[PDB]
Amino acid sequence: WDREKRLSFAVPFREMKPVIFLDVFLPRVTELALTASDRQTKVAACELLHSMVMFMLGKATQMPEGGQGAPPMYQLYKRTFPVLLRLACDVDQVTRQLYEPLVMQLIHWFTNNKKFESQDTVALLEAILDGIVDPVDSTLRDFCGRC
Amino acid sequence: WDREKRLSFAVPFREMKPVIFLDVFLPRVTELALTASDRQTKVAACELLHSMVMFMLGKATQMPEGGQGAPPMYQLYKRTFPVLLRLACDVDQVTRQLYEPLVMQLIHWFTNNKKFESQDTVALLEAILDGIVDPVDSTLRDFCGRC
Amino acid sequence: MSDFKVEFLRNELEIPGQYDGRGKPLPEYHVRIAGFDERVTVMASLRRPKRIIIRGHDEREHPFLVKGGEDLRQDQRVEQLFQVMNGILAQDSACSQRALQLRTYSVVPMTSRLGLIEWLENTVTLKDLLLNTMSQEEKAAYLSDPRAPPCEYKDWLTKMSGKHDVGAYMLMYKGANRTETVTSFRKRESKVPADLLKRAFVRMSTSPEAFLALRSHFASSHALICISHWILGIGDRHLNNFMVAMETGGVIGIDFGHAFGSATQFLPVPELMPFRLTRQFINLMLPMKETGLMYSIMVHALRAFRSDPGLLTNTMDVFVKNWYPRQKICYAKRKLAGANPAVITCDELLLGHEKAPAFRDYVAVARGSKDHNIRAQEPESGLSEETQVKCLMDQATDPNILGRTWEGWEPWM
Amino acid sequence: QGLIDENPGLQLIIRNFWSHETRLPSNTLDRLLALNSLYSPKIEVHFLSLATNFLLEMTSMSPDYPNPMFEHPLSECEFQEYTIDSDWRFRSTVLTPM
Numbered sequence: 188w189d190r191e192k193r194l195s196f197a198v199p200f201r202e203m204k205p206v207i208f209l210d211v212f213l214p215r216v217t218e219l220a221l222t223a224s225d226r227q228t229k230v231a232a233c234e235l236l237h238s239m240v241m242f243m244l245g246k247a248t249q250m251p252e253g254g255q256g257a258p259p260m261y262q263l264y265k266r267t268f269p270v271l272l273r274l275a276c277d278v279d280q281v282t283r284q285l286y287e288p289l290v291m292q293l294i295h296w297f298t299n300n301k302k303f304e305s306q307d308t309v310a311l312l313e314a315i316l317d318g319i320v321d322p323v324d325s326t327l328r329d330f331c332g333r334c
Numbered sequence: 335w336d337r338e339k340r341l342s343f344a345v346p347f348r349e350m351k352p353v354i355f356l357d358v359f360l361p362r363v364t365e366l367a368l369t370a371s372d373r374q375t376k377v378a379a380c381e382l383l384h385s386m387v388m389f390m391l392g393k394a395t396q397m398p399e400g401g402q403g404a405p406p407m408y409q410l411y412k413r414t415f416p417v418l419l420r421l422a423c424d425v426d427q428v429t430r431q432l433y434e435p436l437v438m439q440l441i442h443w444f445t446n447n448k449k450f451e452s453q454d455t456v457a458l459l460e461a462i463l464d465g466i467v468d469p470v471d472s473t474l475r476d477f478c479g480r481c
Numbered sequence: 482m483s484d485f486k487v488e489f490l491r492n493e494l495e496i497p498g499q500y501d502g503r504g505k506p507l508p509e510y511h512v513r514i515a516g517f518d519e520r521v522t523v524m525a526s527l528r529r530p531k532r533i534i535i536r537g538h539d540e541r542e543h544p545f546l547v548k549g550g551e552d553l554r555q556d557q558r559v560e561q562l563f564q565v566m567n568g569i570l571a572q573d574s575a576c577s578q579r580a581l582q583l584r585t586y587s588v589v590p591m592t593s594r595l596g597l598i599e600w601l602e603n604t605v606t607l608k609d610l611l612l613n614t615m616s617q618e619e620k621a622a623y624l625s626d627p628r629a630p631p632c633e634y635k636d637w638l639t640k641m642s643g644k645h646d647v648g649a650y651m652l653m654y655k656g657a658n659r660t661e662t663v664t665s666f667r668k669r670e671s672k673v674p675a676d677l678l679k680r681a682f683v684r685m686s687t688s689p690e691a692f693l694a695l696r697s698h699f700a701s702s703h704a705l706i707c708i709s710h711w712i713l714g715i716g717d718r719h720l721n722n723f724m725v726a727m728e729t730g731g732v733i734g735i736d737f738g739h740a741f742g743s744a745t746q747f748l749p750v751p752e753l754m755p756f757r758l759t760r761q762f763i764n765l766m767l768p769m770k771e772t773g774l775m776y777s778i779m780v781h782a783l784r785a786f787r788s789d790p791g792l793l794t795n796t797m798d799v800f801v802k803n804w805y806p807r808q809k810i811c812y813a814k815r816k817l818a819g820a821n822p823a824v825i826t827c828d829e830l831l832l833g834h835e836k837a838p839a840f841r842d843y844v845a846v847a848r849g850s851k852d853h854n855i856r857a858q859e860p861e862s863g864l865s866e867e868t869q870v871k872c873l874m875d876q877a878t879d880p881n882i883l884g885r886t887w888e889g890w891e892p893w894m
Numbered sequence: 895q896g897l898i899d900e901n902p903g904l905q906l907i908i909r910n911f912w913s914h915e916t917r918l919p920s921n922t923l924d925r926l927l928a929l930n931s932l933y934s935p936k937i938e939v940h941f942l943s944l945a946t947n948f949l950l951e952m953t954s955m956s957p958d959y960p961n962p963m964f965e966h967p968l969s970e971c972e973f974q975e976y977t978i979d980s981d982w983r984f985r986s987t988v989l990t991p992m
């Protein structure tokens with residue numbers, strides 16, 4: 188999902204500081220989050236993905252790259268936002284309470300004055316719109332509307 | 335020099351992570367840097383202040399506060415820039431080589447597209463101008479001009 | 482262009498070239514022109530095209546690479562032939578098992594001197610990809626290193642009695658023994674970094690489970706495109722002229738400013754390369770070798786094409802409009818029926834230019850030495866697909882014929 | 895008393911003595927409580943510097959020590975390294991246009 192591997196984590200051992208790339212986890216973690224059967228697995232995955240998307244936002248603000256091309260983590264946002272969306276307004280009450288507020292918070296952030304212009308907001312809006320048009324996920328429509 | 339103490343450092347011990355506020359060092363470190371007599375002390379101080387101003391820039395980009403008032407570390411910039419300036423074009427060759435490039439680099443950064451508008455650049459420009467008008471530091475004039 | 486506003490008394494313009502005859506159109510769906518943005522950029526090549534960005538009915542963009550000055554009708558027709566080509570590939574079972582498909586792109590000849598070409602979104606130029614992956618250190622080793630020509634080549638012209646930049650090749654073919662040229666070519670190729678594309682892909686694929694797939698797919702795509710091009714799409718394989726789809730790994734044919742024959746009839750840039758099998762592609766299948774996946778897929782493809790030749794032979798009669806076409810099509814049918822690719826390229830040279838002082842040595846180069854080139858052993862006609870492909874391989878990758886090729890057609894990549 | 899000795903060499907040697915693991919404890923708080931014992935009236939004028947040096951040089955072997963303080967640079971600009979000459983010379987010393 189990304190040419191070069193952002194989401195650099197530094198799992199903080201004591202005797203050393205190795206780096207673990209959280210992006211490689213993500214494409215499978217998200218699939219778990221949407222469609223896992225065992226609900227313990229699903230809720231655990233959802234809580235991981237909440238943590239991980241929060242990390243995306245964080246590593247974004249520690250901008251390593253101020254534009255001059257595709258914004259960093261845009262490529263990641265494009266494919267994590269539809270996940271975040273249709274995983275909100277899922278029909279697990281726990282996931283719903285966990286992600287509906289976060290999607291609202293994300294929408295909030297992505298019209299904060301700082302980087303109101305950025306392609307990241309462009310992408311998120313594009314995601315919401317392709318969320319409206321969603322053919323099958325009937326209930327996704329309503330949350331996308333509220334979004 | 336600042337109401338609330340930015341420049342939060344986390345001197346990285348092993349068994350714990352205490353926080354040391356580098357800002358309290360600064361008002362005396364700078365005086366050392368400009369006017370110290372013992373040249374070993376002076377060069378050491380200069381190298382500390384280079385490190386410390388670099389830290390200012392770093393902690394700036396880890397914006398904890400995106401405006402909505404006085405930009406953070408503006409109050410610090412106002413009183414560290416005249417230091418940085420007139421400490422460049424000092425008459426110690428080591429300090430000169432160390433800080434003239436940094437002042438050029440700072441001027442460079444503070445017209446990078448990202449935060450070209452910020453009051454930080456306003457302050458730095460105001461500093462350069464009050465550097466031109468400097469009455470006594472004759473040689474400061476020329477460096478300020480080049481700046 | 483600036484002031485297009487959708488307005489009455491004006492028939493709405495639908496985005497050029499949005500029809501493909503696999504079914505009744507549903508003509509309402511097609512996106513129609515709705516003004517188009519600024520920021521046209523050029524593509525940095527001779528006959529500078531530029532890159533319009535048309536936005537339409539749907540607010541999703543549609544870059545179309547406006548391009549003029551050429552009788553694009555050629556490109557349109559050749560793209561249509563790939564279309565039928567891809568059909569013939571699909572309709573077989575053996576080939577379809579591996580899901581081979583050339584990728585076509587809409588060519589819409591707008592007039593005698595203008596025609597849009599749909600930009601393939603999310604793709605990068607092969608030499609662009611290559612140069613992009615190389616380390617900034619060695620990047621200077623192509624931009625400018627002590628061997629000022631990308632690898633010693635333009636300088637080596639002088640060493641081969643060639644003084645000036647253009648046309649000096651017209652002399653080297655005289656005294657070029659099979660050794661000093663070949664040894665030089667080995668050297669220059671060696672200097673160029675190895676494990677390039679391999680690095681690019683390793684960067685591309687997530688987990689080693691994916692590298693093998695993407696490699697198979699790149700190899701298949703480049704293979705199929707190569708063979709199909711040998712059928713007709715010869716010529717002008719500048720490393721700008723192979724696009725690689727970052728998204729999916731396909732190698733997509735790009736330019737066809739010279740179709741079949743148009744490569745080698747045009748004397749000032751004599752070309753004896755039927756394929757593009759230069760080093761970095763070989764080195765990709767590193768532990769394997771050429772004649773690994775690539776040769777097999779060659780065999781399969783060519784066997785497919787010859788199954789019902791009329792479908793493709795007696796389709797390129799679109800050259801209705803002596804006659805050069807009446808004979809280039811003849812070469813085509815000859816090769817499809819099976820001729821020593823050396824023989825067909827030699828005939829191409831023989832018709833190409835009999836007035837130059839080289840066509841003796843040109844023909845000699847094409848044929849290749851009997852001792853160490855497996856092309857020269859086969860009969861001029863009546864070839865079996867196995868033999869046809871294998872001979873064509875050697876003719877493509879032969880160090881000798883490669884090494885003396887045109888600068889620009891970067892034979893080392 | 896030796897911790898201030900005139901020769902820099904013995905200075906380093908005695909300090910390295912007092913910083914080996916089995917002399918002053920290895921964690922922080924046990925160090926901070928220990929350094930109070932490392933004091934005498936005569937070591938005064940330097941005692942502050944000496945305490946600081948001990949504490950930080952135990953910081954020196956912690957894992958974040960070489961890990962760069964800020965994860966990303968602030969641009970794409972290429973970074974070179976240059977040494978500073980510092981050859982026992984100041985700046986107003988060589989007459990101008992030679």
Ligand SMILES: Nc1ncnc2c1ncn2[C@@H]1O[C@H](COP(=O)(O)OP(=O)(O)O)[C@@H](O)[C@H]1O
Pocket residue numbers: 524526527528530546586598599600601602606721722724735736738
């Ligand atoms: N289908 C395409 N999609 C996007 N860009 C393309 C496409 N085809 C060509 N290009 C651009 O066109 C350039 C090549 O121009 P080309 O079509 O070969 O005409 P010419 O033969 O004059 O170069 C390449 O550098 C590539 O960047």
